[PDB]
Design an enzyme around this catalytic site. Structure first.
Site, mmCIF file in Angstrom:
data_model
loop_
_atom_site.group_PDB
_atom_site.id
_atom_site.type_symbol
_atom_site.label_atom_id
_atom_site.label_comp_id
_atom_site.label_asym_id
_atom_site.label_seq_id
_atom_site.Cartn_x
_atom_site.Cartn_y
_atom_site.Cartn_z
ATOM 1 N N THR A 1 0.774 -1.251 0.000
ATOM 2 C CA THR A 1 0.000 0.000 0.000
ATOM 3 C C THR A 1 0.795 1.285 0.000
ATOM 4 O OG1 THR A 1 -1.720 -1.135 1.111
ATOM 5 C CG2 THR A 1 -1.867 1.222 1.237
ATOM 6 N N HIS B 1 -8.020 -9.742 2.505
ATOM 7 C CA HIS B 1 -7.080 -10.449 3.353
ATOM 8 C C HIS B 1 -7.792 -11.553 4.150
ATOM 9 C CE1 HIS B 1 -3.219 -8.297 3.142
ATOM 10 N NE2 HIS B 1 -3.906 -7.170 3.140
HETATM 11 C C1 XGI Z 1 -3.385 4.848 2.828
HETATM 12 N N1 XGI Z 1 -4.216 5.783 3.585
HETATM 13 C C2 XGI Z 1 -4.520 5.776 4.954
HETATM 14 C C3 XGI Z 1 -4.024 4.726 5.891
HETATM 15 O O1 XGI Z 1 -3.296 3.798 5.520
HETATM 16 N N2 XGI Z 1 -4.416 4.834 7.192
HETATM 17 C C4 XGI Z 1 -5.332 5.632 8.040
HETATM 18 C C5 XGI Z 1 -5.118 4.601 9.165
HETATM 19 C C6 XGI Z 1 -3.955 4.017 8.367
HETATM 20 C C7 XGI Z 1 -3.694 2.501 8.303
HETATM 21 O O2 XGI Z 1 -2.264 2.742 8.398
HETATM 22 C C8 XGI Z 1 -2.509 4.092 8.886
HETATM 23 C C9 XGI Z 1 -5.340 6.858 5.149
HETATM 24 N N3 XGI Z 1 -5.528 7.537 3.975
HETATM 25 C C10 XGI Z 1 -4.825 6.886 3.077
HETATM 26 C C11 XGI Z 1 -4.748 7.332 1.662
HETATM 27 O O3 XGI Z 1 -3.427 7.832 1.346
HETATM 28 C C12 XGI Z 1 -3.154 8.206 0.041
HETATM 29 C C13 XGI Z 1 -4.122 8.177 -0.937
HETATM 30 C C14 XGI Z 1 -3.802 8.590 -2.208
HETATM 31 CL CL1 XGI Z 1 -5.056 8.534 -3.399
HETATM 32 C C15 XGI Z 1 -2.514 9.012 -2.547
HETATM 33 C C16 XGI Z 1 -2.185 9.442 -3.882
HETATM 34 N N4 XGI Z 1 -1.976 9.790 -4.949
HETATM 35 C C17 XGI Z 1 -1.556 9.048 -1.546
HETATM 36 C C18 XGI Z 1 -1.830 8.615 -0.243
HETATM 37 C C19 XGI Z 1 -0.739 8.699 0.837
HETATM 38 C C20 XGI Z 1 -1.121 9.838 1.803
HETATM 39 C C21 XGI Z 1 -0.610 7.368 1.597
HETATM 40 C C22 XGI Z 1 0.658 8.943 0.244
HETATM 41 CA CA CA Z 2 -3.156 -1.551 -0.178
HETATM 42 ZN ZN ZN Z 3 -3.474 -5.379 2.151
#
Ligand code: XGI
Ligand code: CA
Ligand code: ZN
Ligand SMILES: *[C@@H]1O[C@H](CO)[C@@H](O[C@@H]2O[C@H](CO)[C@@H](O[C@@H]3O[C@H](CO[C@H]4O[C@H](CO)[C@@H](O)[C@H](O[C@H]5O[C@H](CO)[C@@H](O)[C@H](O)[C@@H]5O[C@H]5O[C@H](CO)[C@@H](O)[C@H](O)[C@@H]5O)[C@@H]4O)[C@@H](O)[C@H](O[C@H]4O[C@H](CO)[C@@H](O)[C@H](O)[C@@H]4O[C@H]4O[C@H](CO)[C@@H](O)[C@H](O)[C@@H]4O)[C@@H]3O)[C@H](O)[C@H]2NC(C)=O)[C@H](O)[C@H]1NC(C)=O
Ligand code: CA
Ligand code: K
Ligand code: NA
EC number: 3.1.4.39
Length: 805
Positions: free
Chosen positions: A159, A265
């Site tokens: 991710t 998953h």
């Molecule tokens: C992945 N995520 C998470 C996440 O994982 N959360 C919240 C709780 C947890 C689980 O572990 C911590 C929250 N919001 C995102 C989306 O992030 C994105 C989306 C997009 Cl579309 C793009 C682009 N282009 C970039 C990002 C980043 C900012 C990752 C670089």
């Molecule tokens: Ca993912």
């Molecule tokens: Zn996954």
């Protein structure tokens, strides 16, 4: 420390993060534990749900409600997304016919069409066909807009590396997020999914889209959504932002769903429980589109529906345990799962030897479901080496499997039926792309492409100049109705010399012999003209490559092939030849076995010599133009010129000989002729980029002949295979590879067998894009075609993956 007793009234989902200890009302406040006391009361309202009903129409605004069905909600931009459907007789967006969007149809004051990035975690490419009956909003986006059959993620197919790649146009090795978990030895810190360290900005390199926007005057909504914000609230918040006035309204937005990854998953990619998460995502898409339609923005906004990676079937029982291989298992740390990274548990342990680890992990069980690599020996297409956060030892895991250190790790943590992270060419890891809006084409299918290319396009959609990135800007112009980026070919930096006959045979003392003393004016003019370039139009089909750096080189012509010979590296940078469908293979005669001939156009001082090879007990030599495919016995002497020779380990010569003697002719029969460009690559510092002279770590013993780390070939023919390669009217077809130049075949477990059982499998593993070879050599190919340059850019980014459909 946050003083969480200030207020969030009229600041809910603020776009300007305020510094602690002022209490925050933005997206990361939950993830920092710093929200004002009333954040949940004011900004996470849920009363009465997410939908209008007949009874709510015309209600008196009541600010406790999650969304509104009052008469004033539209101009406030806080209606429930189904308000006009329920209260004003309108249709759902999904029920309206597709109508081409020729121009942005935006409210006054919009200076450019907004972009919304709708990213979906773990949305495997095949869900678009397999789940189509349950995703009608997504199917409409897909069939009405521009879509690819699939999009290729980066390695590892996790991710963070992928979303951060989407944001930056960079490979993980350059942006720094090389895994979901990482250790940086410079900072002596660890990055994990769980916890706070991942929020520190030193992890995150390059320049992500939202910074690129901000620096160029374009405002952005949030990209990171707290897990405690429900999807309906993310959508409403985006719609609200879009209702802001001109001077405050962002132009780029991101939505992120944790599904279908999260279910996937637990249940596997196609578990029966997966239908519902696909329905829910689709409903969310419909909410957005109905919401956009109410605001009159549904033919104004560009929407990208994109995933980060797919999902494969993986269970507990398909785990390999390093403890079955290594006696020393407690002296190593493993990053485990769908890939493996190994480092020493302690750097004070000088007994730890990576080479002995590698050896203990190599071809030990007959069906071993991982393969160990030094990171510089990984397939160059992965671009997974040039970062200190990537451990030296890497395990590429077979699809469907896991690796773990010890069995205790997998039963003291079966829980899961799906995982991802594998090699980015694996079908199950592929993901999606649909683009929908005024700037995208209408009902258009485009070929598969890599996610590293999207940053450029998103910049194009927003009028921004991209930061330097690994995309090939222009290679996705065919997705776009307008705002295409029209690049110029890079300028040649070094012009070639064209030497004629300047040296006598007796000036060469090479230790080289050739039994060639075998003596007419019909074919004396004939051969002079071959040496002045008479067959060049045959063997150089797409013009000579341009050398994009400062060097000294010679163009050498011959009957069967043309080369650009480097006087600095003492060998060809490139050798180019065409093999027709009807070409015949001949063996190397015995009068020519260890024949190497001086090339009278090139001084002794800029030539290789045989004595170095004789002295060097590890290193032998091969040829770039294969003598097996010479057009005639007189022409075969040219293949034995010293200027056609390159250093090759005997173990690699088995690979090379098979490619040359068998596979090239096979490809020419299958493709109706092929043009081949072959040459050496020197990447001793594993940065994916052409080394300078002073970076070279290994020479043939006692000489200045540098040893390549790799050998490339680019095999081009006519996409319409009824036309021969040398007479192609239209679009081209290409496959390429970058073969590691290794002194053993340890990488291939079946290598004691005949080459027909293993060499091709090795070559497929090391398939490459032309663009990879360009970075590695500083050459620019396809300079002279009849095709548009963007179409050529697309060809140069193509990767032949050798997966079934
Ligand atoms: C992945 N995520 C998470 C996440 O994982 N959360 C919240 C709780 C947890 C689980 O572990 C911590 C929250 N919001 C995102 C989306 O992030 C994105 C989306 C997009 Cl579309 C793009 C682009 N282009 C970039 C990002 C980043 C900012 C990752 C670089
Ligand atoms: Ca993912
Ligand atoms: Zn996954
Ligand atoms: C994919 O696209 C990307 C982007 O286009 C390509 O990466 C670029 O490659 C360039 C060529 O290698 C590289 O240029 C170098 O930049 C150095 C300055 O770097 C800093 O500032 C930039 C600009 O804002 C920033 O991008 C950098 O960010 C890196 O570093 C931090 C961590 O330290 C990371 O957070 C971030 O993720 C990024 O890491 C990546 O890059 C570094 C290398 O820069 C890697 O080590 C990491 O593993 C990771 O891959 C920086 O903050 C600059 O100093 C370099 O200049 C040296 O060389 C020239 C030779 O002419 C010389 O003139 C200079 O003086 C200097 O030499 C001196 O230093 C030498 C080394 O210390 C020393 O030996 C000599 O003796 C000299 O005294 C150089 O110009 C550019 O940084 C990156 N950009 C990014 C984002 O990665 C990439 O190549 C593409 N991939 C492919 C396959 O095509
Ligand atoms: Ca290099
Ligand atoms: K030798
Ligand atoms: Na082997």
């Amino acid at each position: 420390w946050t003083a969480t007793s200030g207020s969030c009234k009229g600041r809910c989902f603020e776009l300007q993060e305020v510094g602690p200890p002022d209490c925050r009302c933005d997206n990361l406040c939950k993830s920092y534990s710093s929200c004002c006391h009333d954040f949940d009361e004011l900004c996470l309202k849920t009363a009465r749900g997410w939908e209008c009903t007949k009874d709510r129409c015309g209600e008196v605004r009541n600010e406790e409600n999650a969304c509104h069905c009052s008469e004033d909600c539209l101009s406030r931009g806080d209606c429930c997304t189904n308000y006009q459907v329920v209260c004003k007789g309108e249709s759902h967006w999904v029920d309206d016919d597709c109508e081409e969007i020729k121009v942005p149809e935006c409210p006054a004051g919009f200076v450019r069409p907004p972009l919304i990035i709708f990213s979906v975690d773990g949305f495997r490419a095949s869900y678009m066909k397999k789940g189509s009956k349950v995703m009608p909003n997504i199917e409409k986006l897909r069939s009405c807009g521009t879509h690819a059959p699939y999009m290729r993620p980066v390695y590892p197919t996790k991710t963070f590396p992928n979303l951060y790649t989407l944001a930056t146009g960079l490979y993980p090795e350059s942006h720094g997020i090389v895994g979901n978990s990482m250790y940086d030895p410079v900072f002596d810190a660890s990055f994990h999914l769980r916890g706070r360290e991942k929020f520190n900005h030193r992890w995150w390199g390059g320049q992500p889209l939202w910074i690129t926007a901000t620096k160029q005057g374009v405002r952005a909504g949030t990209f990171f959504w707290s897990v405690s914000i429900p999807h309906e609230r993310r959508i409403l918040t985006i719609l609200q932002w879009l209702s802001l006035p001109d001077n405050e309204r962002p132009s780029v937005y991101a939505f992120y769903s944790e599904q279908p990854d999260f279910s996937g998953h637990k249940y596997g990619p196609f578990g029966p429980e997966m239908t519902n998460p696909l329905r829910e995502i689709d409903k969310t898409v419909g909410q957005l589109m109905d919401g956009l339609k109410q605001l009159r923005l549904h033919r104004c906004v560009n929407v990208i529906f994109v995933g980060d990676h797919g999902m494969e079937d993986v269970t507990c029982d398909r785990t390999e345990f390093l403890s079955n291989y290594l006696t020393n298992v407690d002296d190593i740390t493993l990053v485990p799962g769908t890939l493996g990274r190994i480092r020493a548990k302690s750097i004070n342990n000088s007994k730890y030897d990576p080479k002995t680890i590698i050896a203990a992990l190599t071809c030990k069980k007959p069906d071993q479901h991982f393969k160990p690599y030094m990171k510089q020996h990984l397939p160059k297409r992965l671009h997974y080496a040039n970062n200190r956060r990537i451990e030296d030892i890497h395990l590429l895991v077979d699809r469907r499997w896991h690796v773990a250190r010890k069995p205790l790790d997998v039963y003291k943590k079966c829980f899961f039926q799906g995982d991802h992270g594998f090699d980015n060419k694996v079908n199950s890891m592929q993901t999606v792309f649909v683009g929908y809006g005024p700037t995208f084409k209408y009902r258009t299918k485009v070929p598969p492409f890599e996610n590293i290319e999207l940053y450029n396009v998103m910049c194009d959609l927003l009028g921004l100049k991209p930061a330097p990135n690994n995309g090939t800007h222009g290679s996705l112009n065919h997705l776009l109705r307008t705002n295409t980026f029209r690049p110029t070919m890079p300028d040649e930096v070094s012009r070639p010399n064209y030497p004629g006959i300047m040296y006598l045979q007796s000036e060469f003392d090479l230790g080289c012999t050739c039994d060639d003393k075998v003596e007419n004016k019909l074919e004396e003019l004939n051969k002079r003209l071959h040496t002045k370039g008479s067959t060049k139009e045959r063997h150089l089909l797409y013009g000579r490559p341009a050398v994009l750096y400062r060097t000294s080189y010679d163009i050498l012509y011959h009957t069967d092939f043309e080369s650009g010979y480097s006087e600095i590296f003492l060998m060809p940078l490139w050798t180019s030849y065409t093999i027709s469908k009807q070409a015949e293979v001949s063996s190397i005669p015995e009068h020519l076995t260890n024949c190497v001939r001086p090339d009278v156009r090139v001084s002794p001082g800029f030539s290789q010599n045989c004595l170095a090879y004789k002295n060097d007990k590890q290193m032998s030599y091969g040829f770039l133009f294969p003598p097996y495919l010479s057009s005639s016995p007189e022409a075969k002497y040219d293949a034995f010129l010293v200027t056609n020779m390159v250093p090759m380990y005997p173990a690699f010569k088995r690979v090379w000989a098979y490619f040359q003697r068998v596979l090239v002719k096979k490809y020419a029969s299958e493709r109706n002729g092929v043009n081949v460009i072959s040459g050496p690559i020197f990447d001793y510092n594993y940065d994916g980029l052409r080394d300078t002279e002073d970076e070279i770590k290994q020479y043939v013993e006692g000489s200045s002949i540098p040893v390549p780390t790799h050998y490339y070939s680019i095999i081009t023919s006519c996409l319409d295979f009824t036309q021969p390669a040398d007479k192609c009217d239209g679009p081209l077809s290409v496959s390429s590879f970058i073969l590691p130049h290794r002194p053993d075949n340890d990488e291939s477990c079946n290598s004691s067998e005949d080459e027909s059982k293993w060499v091709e499998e090795l070559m497929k593993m090391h398939t490459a894009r032309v663009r990879d070879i360009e970075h590695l050599t500083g050459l620019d190919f396809y300079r002279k075609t009849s095709r548009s340059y963007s179409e050529i850019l697309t060809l140069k980014t193509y990767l032949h993956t050798y997966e079934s459909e």
